[PDB]
């Protein structure tokens, strides 16, 4: 019942921006925590964003910390991540988790999640 | 400048308060004027020089003009180491609560600052309330004033196990607590709320207070705006002020579980897959195991969760490196059995005893069960120590089994540590040092380790300890009781090899015999007289 999906993707370049969205399906999204995490080229999962169920808490990795920002829309069911000063180190497969449900949890990359959406590829090249 | 933001943040009042306790403690009124003299260095703060300016280092530069060789943080270190109508008439009341403020400040070291401000809150409320009744002041006053003496105690086990042991230690201590605390919170909720504590308080052990009044109102704030993650528990804590509602979150009571959790032996037991996550993830993976066996379990101490978890986590270290290791830890489960065990029937077996006896025969059985163990402690010692312990009985047996473990940690980690403090300054015991430089998860079961001791030689028979004086009978009932359990001590020393059985006949012949005296006409006399049927009544138990 569970399902994420990432959107938003595909080739931009030095210095621009884009914006990755995420629908929820499965329980409801108002009650818990979202994260987004990526994959670079020759790399494990990197954790880059945290929120809370009411969005009133954030957490940034400092490899994109000023530069990107995470929201929410509890009634749209629809994750958001707001990317700007694009560089050529953004370049990976952005997926969106939680840890919502009783399903079994995976761990990679120095967290754990119970559900991933299938992830969408951006490429930042010059 | 921090020296504005927490202006700006905690306000004046509070602010004057919080500059109050720390300058307190640290020099033994004359500076006071200094604290008011700081408010308005604050209102210059908010590029003047000098402002902007560290914290400590303004405060520890400026009273120091004790040692204060290097004036740095790392100095600080070294620093570490070393009348109801009149109550009335004072009601400037904004100079009476001070005045009332610095002592409770004055007396003791390690109060958490953030607690204190709340209390002087309350005193005012009754007196607010007590001048317009006819006259019960001085109960609500005594109710406070008793609770916080504990609270000194605690935090300097806090601080001395944050040294003794890092956060990772007092991290896990906080997810375990936390979990049972808040069940229907996720992980990544509780996770976030240990962080903030953490930070809290390793500011005020360390002893900046500056900040944690500021990062626990910031950490009340939050908890109230997220109620809806977090506990059902949460609403009336958090319609109150602030000193109030922060005060009242740290005594919030368990939340329920949510109804058909899963058992947690898929997902730690039953996956081909832990030891690739414990690999990706360590501990957060085992960080996790805590909060999912925590949150199901309430009526366990903080500290079993802990072996809990350190059981599991010595599990996979072992069986990740085997052949099969799915099959190595299927097991484990069946490890956490006696663990748990341990300790249940420790509280069945005591509060039966307790139940059976009452307070202070509970209190005479432990005196002789301590003294046996070490016979080399002070006579003050084991009567205070035992007498502590007896009134943990009377705190915890009364709870339902599921409250018991819990509170007996509570209260038991006091006692423990206390004790620990003592033993330092004054060794007497191998086994004690040994106990008390043990693991937080040991310490406890160390203690209940112990033997009696079949070296330790009688003491000769001296005849004024167990002979009783006439002036016993004006005691209150506290010391007329220490009295007896001072003789009984010094009974065992006298006779350690003697039953329980011979030596509470003795103790109930004191008892009897304090009674008869007490209410004869010539008390002189029949202290004299019965004296000698004492005497001859051990002597036909005990010799």
């Avoid at chain 2, 037991?269 to 379990?297: I, P, Q, T, W």
């Avoid at chain 2, 409250?403 to 003592?422: I, T």
């Avoid at chain 2, 329980?500 to 015999?513: I, S």
Wanted: charge should be negative.
């Amino acid at each position: 019942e569970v399902q994420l999906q990432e959107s938003g993707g595909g080739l931009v370049q030095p210095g621009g921006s884009l914006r990755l969205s995420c629908a929820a399906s499965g329980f409801t999204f108002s009650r818990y925590w979202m994260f987004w995490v990526r994959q670079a080229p020759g790399k494990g999962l990197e954790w880059i964003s945290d929120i809370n169920s009411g969005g009133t808490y954030t957490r940034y990795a400092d490899s994109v910390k000023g530069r990107f920002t995470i929201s929410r829309d509890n009634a749209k069911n629809t994750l958001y991540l707001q990317m700007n000063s694009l560089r050529a180190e953004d370049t990976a497969v952005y997926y969106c988790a939680t840890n919502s449900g009783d399903g079994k949890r995976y761990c990679s990359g120095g967290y754990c999640y119970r559900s991933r959406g299938q992830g969408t590829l951006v490429t930042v090249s010059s | 400048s921090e020296v504005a933001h927490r202006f700006k943040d905690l306000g004046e009042e509070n602010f004057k308060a919080l500059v109050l306790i720390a300058f307190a403690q640290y020099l033994q009124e004359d500076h006071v004027k200094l604290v008011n003299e700081v408010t308005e260095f604050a209102k210059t703060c908010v590029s003047a020089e000098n402002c902007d300016k560290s914290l400590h280092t303004l405060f520890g530069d400026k009273l120091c003009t004790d040692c204060c060789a290097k004036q740095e943080p790392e100095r600080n270190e070294c620093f570490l180491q070393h009348e109801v109508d009149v109550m009335c008439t004072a009601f400037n009341e904004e100079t009476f609560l001070k005045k009332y403020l610095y002592e409770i400040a004055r007396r003791h070291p390690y109060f958490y600052a953030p607690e204190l401000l709340f209390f002087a809150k309350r005193y005012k409320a009754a007196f607010t309330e007590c001048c317009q009744a006819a006259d019960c002041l001085l109960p609500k006053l005594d109710e406070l004033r008793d609770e916080g003496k504990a609270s000194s105690a605690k935090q300097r086990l806090k601080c001395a196990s944050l040294q003794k042991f890092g956060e990772r230690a007092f991290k896990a201590w906080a997810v375990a607590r936390l979990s049972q605390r808040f069940p229907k919170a996720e992980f990544a909720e509780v996770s976030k709320l240990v962080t903030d504590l953490t930070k809290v308080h390793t500011e005020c052990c360390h002893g900046d207070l500056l900040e944690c009044a500021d990062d626990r109102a910031d950490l009340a704030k939050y908890i109230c705006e997220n109620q809806d993650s977090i506990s059902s528990k949460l609403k009336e804590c958090c319609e109150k002020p602030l000193l109030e509602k922060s005060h009242c979150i740290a005594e919030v009571e368990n939340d329920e579980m949510p109804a058909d959790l899963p058992s947690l032996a898929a997902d730690f037991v039953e996956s081909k897959d832990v030891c690739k996550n414990y690999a990706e993830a360590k501990d957060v993976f085992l960080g996790m195991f805590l909060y999912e066996y925590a949150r199901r379990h309430p009526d366990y101490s903080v500290v079993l969760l802990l072996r809990l978890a350190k059981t599991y986590e010595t599990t996979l270290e072992k069986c990740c490196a085997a052949a099969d290791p799915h099959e190595c830890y299927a097991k484990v489960f069946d490890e956490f059995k006696p663990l748990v065990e341990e300790p249940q029937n420790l509280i069945k077996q005591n509060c039966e005893l307790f139940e059976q006896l009452g307070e202070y025969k509970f209190q005479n059985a432990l005196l002789v069960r301590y003294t046996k163990k070490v016979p080399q402690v002070s006579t003050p010692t084991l009567v205070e120590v035992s007498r502590n312990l007896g009134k943990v009985g009377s705190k915890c047996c009364k709870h339902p089994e599921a409250k018991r473990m819990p509170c007996a940690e509570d209260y038991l980690s006091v006692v423990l540590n206390q004790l620990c403090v003592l033993h330092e300054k004054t060794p007497v015991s191998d086994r004690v040092t040994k106990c008390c430089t043990e693991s937080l998860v040991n310490r406890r079961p160390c203690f209940s380790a112990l033997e009696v001791d079949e070296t330790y030689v009688p003491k000769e028979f001296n005849a004024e300890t167990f002979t009783f004086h006439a002036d016993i009978c004006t005691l209150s009932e506290k010391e007329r009781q220490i009295k007896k359990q001072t003789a009984l001590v010094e009974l065992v020393k006298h006779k350690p090899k003697a039953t329980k059985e011979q030596l509470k006949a003795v103790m109930d012949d004191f008892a009897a015999f304090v009674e008869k005296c007490c209410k004869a006409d010539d008390k002189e006399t029949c202290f004299a007289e019965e004296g000698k049927k004492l005497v001859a009544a051990s002597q036909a138990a005990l010799g």
